Amino acid sequence: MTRGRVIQVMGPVVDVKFENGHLPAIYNALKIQHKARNENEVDIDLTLEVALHLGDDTVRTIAMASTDGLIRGMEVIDTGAPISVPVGEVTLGRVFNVLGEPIDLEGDIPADARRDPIHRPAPKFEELATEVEILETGIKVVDLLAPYIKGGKIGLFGGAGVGKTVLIQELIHNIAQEHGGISVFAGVGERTREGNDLYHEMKDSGVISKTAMVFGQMNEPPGARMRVALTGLTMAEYFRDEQGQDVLLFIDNIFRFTQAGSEVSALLGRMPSAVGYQPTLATEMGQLQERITSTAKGSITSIQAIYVPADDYTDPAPATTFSHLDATTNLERKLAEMGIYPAVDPLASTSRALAPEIVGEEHYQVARKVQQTLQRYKELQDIIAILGMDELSDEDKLVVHRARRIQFFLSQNFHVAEQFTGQPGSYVPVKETVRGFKEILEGKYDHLPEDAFRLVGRIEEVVEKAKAM
Template identity: 70%
Template sequence: MLTTRGAVARLSRRAASSAKKTNAFFSTAALSQRVPSQSSSSRQSSSRPQRASPVAARSYATEAKQVVGSVKTVIGAVVDVQFDTENLPPILNALEVQDFHGGRLVLEVASHLGENSVRTIAMDGTEGLVRGQKVVDTGAPILVPVGTGTLGRIMNVIGEPIDERGPIKGVKLSPIHADPPPFVEQSTTAEVLETGIKVVDLLAPYARGGKIGLFGGAGVGKTVLIQELINNVAKAHGGFSIFCGVGERTREGNDLYHEMIETGVINLEGDSKVALVFGQMNEPPGARARVALTGLTIAEYFRDEEGQDVLLFIDNIFRFTQAGSEVSALLGRIPSAVGYQPTLSTDMGGMQERITTTKKGSITSVQAVYVPADDLTDPAPATTFAHLDATTVLSRGIAELGIYPAVDPLDSKSRMLDPRIVGREHYDVATAVQKILQDYKSLQDIIAILGMDELSEEDKLTVERARKIQRFMSQPFQVAQVFTGYEGKLVSLKDTVRSFKEILSGAHDSLPESAFYMSGTIEDVKAKAEQLAKEMGN
C-alpha cells in the first residue's frame, strides 16, 4: 500500500510539473500570437484612450497576421465563413469580402460554429455573393470615422459617406462596440439640460445625460422640435448633435437632410451642428441593428475627447429592437415573449448604458418611440421605458389649436421635476400650471354644453388664465422662422419660471389672450399687447 501511495504521489508530482510546462508553453505561444506588434497597432491607436472598450481590453489573434477565409454558406443576411486555421476571429470582429461586385461588404462575426467556421451577419445586401469568395478578417470590430469631419455629413452603418460629397476627411476611427464609462468617471449629480423651449423646461425638463422618449404621430411637429433642439443645444451649450435614422423611411431621412440645410443646421460650405447616420428600413437587419451604435460612437467621441454636451437623436428606437429580433431569428436562437430575441434586455441595456454623463461631457438622447398596436406592455417599448428619464408627448389636439410645439403639458413627464433637483419655486410653479390646465380640461364639457356664462366667477378666472397659459406655451422656433414669419425665441429657464409665475398670480389678467400666442418671455407679451392696443386705437 505504501509503495502504491508513493508511486501515485510521484505520478501526481510529474503530472503537475508537466501541466505547468505545458501551460507556460501555450501561454507564451498565445501571447506571441495574440499581442500585436507596434507596427500593426494602428487600428488600436484610433480608439479612445480614456476608457477601454471590449475590443481594446482583449487582443486579437488576427492583428499579428491577417487571416483569410472563404464563403461557405449564404442564406440571406447570414453568411458562414470557413477558415483554414483554428485561429478564428473573435465574436463581433468585422470581416470584409474581397472583390465583391456590389462594393464594400462587411460581415460581423455572430457565433463560432466549430470546424474552423464562423457565422456572420452582413451589413449590406448579399446579392451576388457566391461560395468560395475570399473573406479577410480586419482584426477589429466595425471601425467608423469620428470627429468634426463627420459634421454635416450622412453616413451608413460602416461609416461610409452616402451624401455624394466625397470622402470624410481628417477623422479618427473608433470601434462601434464599447463598454459604458466606469462608475468613477460618471457624474453623480442630477443636472437639468436647458433646451430654451418653455413647455419642456418647465413641465418635463431633460436630464443632462438622460434619455427622453418622444411620442407623437405624423404631422404633429416631431421633426421641427428635433431641429430646434439641435439648434438650441448648439447655441446655448456649444454642443453638437447626432441623428440616427434607424429603420425609418428613406424619404423622411432625405427630407430631414434638406430641411436642415434650409434652416442652417447643416451648412454645406461652413461649420455644421449635426452628423447624420442612416440605416433605413430597406437595409438588412444587421445594418439596422448596428446603426444606433455607429451614431453613439460618434457622440461618445465628442463627449470623451472634446468635452461636449452632445444630443443623440434615435428615430426610431423600436426599429433597433425589431432589427435585433430579426437577427436573432436568422441565427436560430429560441425566441422569448412575443417572438422577441432572448437577449432583448441585454441588447437594449448595452446601448442605453453608454448614454450617460461623465465628468468631461454628456450625451443626452431623445428617442422616438413607436408603440406597436398602442400596447405599452409589449416587451419592446416596456424595455425602453425602463431606461427613460422623461417623456415628451406631442398631441394632435394641441396641434389642431395651432399651438406649437404641440407638447401635451399633462401627459409629458420627467423624473427631474423634483424640488430637490429643480428647486422649490420651479416645482411649485410647474405643479400649479398643471393643476390649472387640468381644472380647465374638466370644465370644458360644461362650457361646451352650457357656455361660459354658467360658470362661477372663480371658474371663469381659472378658464381665462388657463387659456393664456396654454397660448403662452406656444413658442416661435428659430428653425421655423422662414415658414411662420415669427422671429425665433430661445427662453432661459429663469425667465420661463418667472413668466408663468406672474401669469398664475394674476399680474397679467388685463392683457388680451392673443398677446400670449407665439411669444417668448412675458416682456414680449407686454410689448405685443401694447402694439395690439395701438392698432385697436387706430
C-alpha cells in the first residue's frame, strides 16, 4: 500500500517515508489532502514532486505550495505518475496553474479528461524533421530579416513599453489564422498584475480563444515556478503530436526558469556550480528545450524572453539559453517612439535561418541589401547631424532616400491594433515582402512620399495609399 508518513518539513522541502518496495519514482506527484480533525489543526490541500531517494525508505520532495500546517505523520497519497495536466480542446481559452487546474472562475475540468505527464523524454533522433523549414509569420521584419524556424527557439529582447505583448499577440493571431495552429503562453515566474493585463488584452482582442495560458508566478514556491514551462509545453505537445499542427509556445522570462532551478537546487542541498547556478543548469535547460523541436507530425516553435542579468551575455544563464536559440528579435524603444510597429531593431536582429541554403538566394540578397542600406544610413546619421541633410553626395542622398523608405516599409498594421486604429491589418506572405523590398531597392517607388510607407502591409497597398494621399 502506497500510504506514507511525513518525516521532515523544512521550508519548501518535505521528506516523506513509505514502506519498503512501495517507494514512488522520481518526479512523481504526491498529494496531501488532510481535513482538520480538531481546532489545533489546519485544512491542507498540497502536492509534492519527488526529487530524491534518501535511503531508509525516505523520499525528499519539493513542494508546489505553502507547507504551513503540515504535521509529522500526516499521510500522503502516491499518485503513481508525475503531475498529470489536462490536454486537448478543453485547455484553449483557459488560464491554468502548474498543476493543470483553472485559475479562471469559468469552471472545473472533469475527471474523465485526458491528462498527459509533465515529465516526458525528448523526441528521439528517428522522430525529428530532417529539413529546416521556415515558420511564416506575416510580420515583415520577422520573416524578412530574422526568419523563424518551425522547431526554433527565438529570443525576445526588450520589454517595458516597446510592444512585446502586441508582438506576441499578433504572432498568435497570424499563426492561428494562416497556419491553423494554436499557441500556449507559459508565464514562468513573472508577476501577477502583468499576467492579469496580458489576460485582459487577449480577452478583448479575441486572441485568447485560440491560446492556452499557464501562469506560475512569483508568489509560488521555487518548485512551482520551475515546472511552469514544462506544464505549458506538455499542452503544446498535445497539438504537436495528436493533432499534428504547428504550435507556438511563449515563455515569458526564461531566466526565471533558470533561477527557480537554482533555488530548488539550493533548497535540495547541492553544491553550487559556476557562479550561483545549479550543477544541472545545462541539463535542466536541455530537458526543457529539446522537447521544443520539429517532428514529422508537427512542430513547436518557441518565442522566449531573456533577461540577461548584469548586462552580461556571458553569464551562464544567458550563455546556456543562447546555445539553443535560433533567432533574436531585438525590440527597440527608438523605433517605437519613431512610429514603427513592430519595434524590431532590423540591424540587431539576427537569425541562423537567414542563409541562402535555407530560405533561398533572392530572399538572402534582398535581406542583405536591406541590412547594408540601413547600416550605411545609421553611419550617415552623424554626417547628416553635423553637416545637414543636403551636400553629402549624390549616392549618400540616394541611399538615405531609399533607406528611410525601407525603414518605414518595415512597419505593419496589425490585426490586434485594429481595435485601436480602425484599419484592418494585414498578413504579408514572404514572397510579397521580398518582392516589395526588391522593388524599393531598385528605385521603383522613389517618387512616392515616404509617409505612405508607414504602417501598411504590401507594396500594392502603398501604391493605393500614395494615390489616396
